[PDB]
Symmetry: D2
Subunit: 125 residues, 4 copies
């Protein structure tokens, strides 16, 4: 008859309803990700044939690295608008520090967070 | 020119992006409510003329009361599906305990959570 | 015999264990407050004589107001260390904007967040 | 001089203060884990010589599996006290279903959650 047990926990996310001990086939619940995490895919899982469908993934935000920025000779462009943490899919804009210019082959000064990873621009004297 | 400061915190909710010190007019951010809380209204606030628009409200879940249920001679209908906490808008179904029947003027056995409040059915011997 | 039902939800906080439908006298659970909220009092509630003891309170963080700061002619002292949100009990330090000085009877430039409220210093030309 | 950047995010946890763009050596922040997650080790990280110390780990709760329980011929012992999710370090107690008894070499009926893993008892007809 295909009933399911309690829905699976996922990293950095939670279901939006109170977990029950058993669910009828065709039942569904939904996830939400922790605030700065981006929910990837379909938020809803459905019970069918004794198994829940695949939960979504909560994609990681990116944190600025002081060490990397110092090494690459860059700084945040907007000191009044500092995205110290950025959501996946969200862009962060840097500038070369005074006395430096973009190196060749460097990434653009504007760069996009993807699941924890920022590819930083590099500046050279 | 109408810039705004950091978005206002709301009870039982958070914005989905990292707060900035200043926002240009027309900028917007969005809220999400804590997992069992229901977001009422529009999740997005927009900055215009120096003020953020009105944030949404996170409506409270309902918790079952043992004392009230004992007093009213009721129990949860489905012992395998116990909604100890219910979301606003979600219904909970009771039954009269063995030897009792609904009193007249009683609420229906099925009853809906609204922002923390459940109106309980009452059974009589 | 004094058993208790599911522990009460509190604003901006959650219990650290999975809620059960019934608790024996002497049982206890504990709360934690949402990240920037300060837990006031004892985090643990205990079941006795059919009632849970009093839960703690989650004290609100304070958010900086651009409008108030502009009106009072002040700015954050440390632009590299901007406490846009401060925890209850945590202090925030302002400076008079260029061309202003503290007014008499003004609060000190350093001021402490208490449950959502900051008493701002005031500067005059 | 050894200043640090914004503290690192950790899975299933958050810092308790608002992130700053730079921290002086000797500064510290603290983490808390999401509600059913158990914080392993020291909650506080300290900035020294340009690096944060190692953050704690948030150990996973365990979810009961209907499929595994059905296969092993077991059920939760206390239907009024169902730990559908258990914290790391917390124990869950099963019983053999009617008509079964513990198999030899089986784990005890009482078993402890560790970071997502429950070792289930097994019953045989």
């Amino acid at each position: 008859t295909g009933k399911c047990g309690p829905p699976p926990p996922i990293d950095n996310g939670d279901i939006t309803s109170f977990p029950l001990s058993v669910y009828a086939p065709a039942s569904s619940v939904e996830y939400q990700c922790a605030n700065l995490y981006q929910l990837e895919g379909n938020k809803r899982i459905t019970c069918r044939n004794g198994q829940w469908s695949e939960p979504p993934k909560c994609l990681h935000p990116c944190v600025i690295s002081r060490e990397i920025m110092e090494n690459y000779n860059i700084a945040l462009r907007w000191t009044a608008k500092q995205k110290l943490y950025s959501r996946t899919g969200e862009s962060v804009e840097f500038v070369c520090k005074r006395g430096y210019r973009l190196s060749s082959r460097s990434h653009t000064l504007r760069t996009t967070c993807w699941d924890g990873k920022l590819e930083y621009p590099t500046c050279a004297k």
